[PDB]
């Protein structure tokens, strides 16, 4: 019964299986969602996002791979937290991060992505978010484009895994989320570099670290949460691309 991914972390102590998904509490008001894409002849690919309780509402970072899996996330939220889901931020226009947009929209959840992610979305087979985030030259989100974001601190580190990749810190916690930009401290590969900026990747990884200097728990798309060594190692792998 247990899902054993070909890519992505395995289930460990602290993980809750719910439907086709896995959930792990990371802090009093933060959970990691994990969903799995089954590739025939290859196996499962795990992808991770976040769920944040901020006061009386829930904020989501990234969809699951599919609409149905994303609906399962909303069902888990209903059963375990039982608060309205106010908004989602999705971290670039690829299936692991935006495959479930229709499910969010059907539920009345407001969605936000980098303007560039919304521009790329149809070209990448994704439904665009309803609202566009824009960024200063230093990478920080323009505040008026991210209204009522609670503790979420949204940072565009520069082109890396993709040109549109964004990252999210959770103020008042030890957590920062690198999405697919960051790989864990023991990874041997940066994953899919097909859409990547190999010249600028290393600087973008370092910029993420410097934007969230305090965070000790680095959450990412395809590994369990790691130390800041994930940032250092990702940057060192990326140095080799130049």
Q: Per CB under 6 A, which of residues 172..191 are in contact with ligand ZZ7? A: 180, 191
Among 181, 236, 240, 233, which Cα is nearest to 208's? 181
Cβ 173 to Zn ion, closest distance in Å? 23
Distance of alpha carbon 45 from alpha carbon 165, whole angstroms: 20
Residue 183 marked as a ligand binder: yes
Q: Which is nearer to ligand ZZ7, 134 or 192 (CB)?
A: 192
Minimum Å gap between C-beta 166 and Zn ion is 12
Closest to 114 measured CA to CA, from 76, 47, 164, 174: 164
Binding to ligand ZZ7 (CB under 6 A) within 34-93 occurs at 37, 39, 45
Of 24, 53, 94, 206, which one interacts with Zn ion (CB under 5 A)? 94
CB nearer to ligand ZZ7: give 6 or 148: 6
Angstrom distance (rounded) from CA 103 to CA 115: 20
Instruction: State the pairing for strand pair 43-54/110-114.
Output: unpaired
Nearer to Zn ion, 180 or 182 (CB): 180
DSSP bridge partners of 43: 39
Three-state SS at 112: strand
Does residue 101 interact with ligand ZZ7 by CB under 6 A? no
Rounded Cα distance, 42 and 45, in Å: 9
Residues placed in the known binding site for Zn(2+) = 92, 94, 96, 161, 180, 222
Residues placed in the known binding site = 92, 94, 96, 161, 180, 183, 192, 222
User: By the criterion CB under 6 A, which residues form the site for ligand ZZ7?
Assistant: 7, 37, 39, 45, 94-96, 180, 191-192, 221-222
């Amino acid at each position: 019964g247990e899902i054993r991914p070909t890519i992505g972390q395995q289930m460990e102590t602290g993980d809750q299986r719910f439907g086709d998904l896995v959930f792990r509490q990371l802090a009093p008001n933060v959970w990691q969602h994990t969903s799995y894409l089954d590739m025939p002849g290859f196996g499962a690919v795990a992808s991770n996002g976040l769920i944040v309780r901020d006061g009386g509402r829930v904020l989501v970072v990234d969809t699951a791979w599919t609409d149905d899996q994303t609906a399962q996330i909303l069902n888990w939220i209903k059963q375990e937290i039982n608060l309205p889901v106010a908004l989602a931020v999705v971290t670039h226009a690829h299936q692991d991060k935006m495959g479930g947009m229709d499910a969010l929209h059907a539920a009345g959840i407001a969605t936000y992505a980098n303007a560039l992610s919304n521009q790329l979305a149809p070209q990448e087979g994704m439904v665009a978010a309803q609202h566009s985030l824009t960024f200063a030259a230093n990478g920080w989100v323009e505040p008026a484009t991210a209204p009522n974001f609670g503790p979420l601190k949204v940072f565009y580190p520069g082109p890396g895994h993709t040109s549109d990749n964004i990252t999210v810190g959770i103020d008042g916690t030890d957590i920062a989320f690198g999405g697919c930009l960051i790989k864990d401290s023991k990874a041997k590969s940066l994953g899919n570099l097909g859409d990547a900026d190999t010249e600028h990747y290393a600087a973008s990884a370092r910029a993420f670290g410097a934007a969230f200097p305090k965070a000790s728990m680095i959450v990412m798309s395809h590994s369990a949460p790691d130390s800041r060594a994930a940032i250092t190692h990702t940057a060192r792998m990326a140095d080799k691309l130049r």
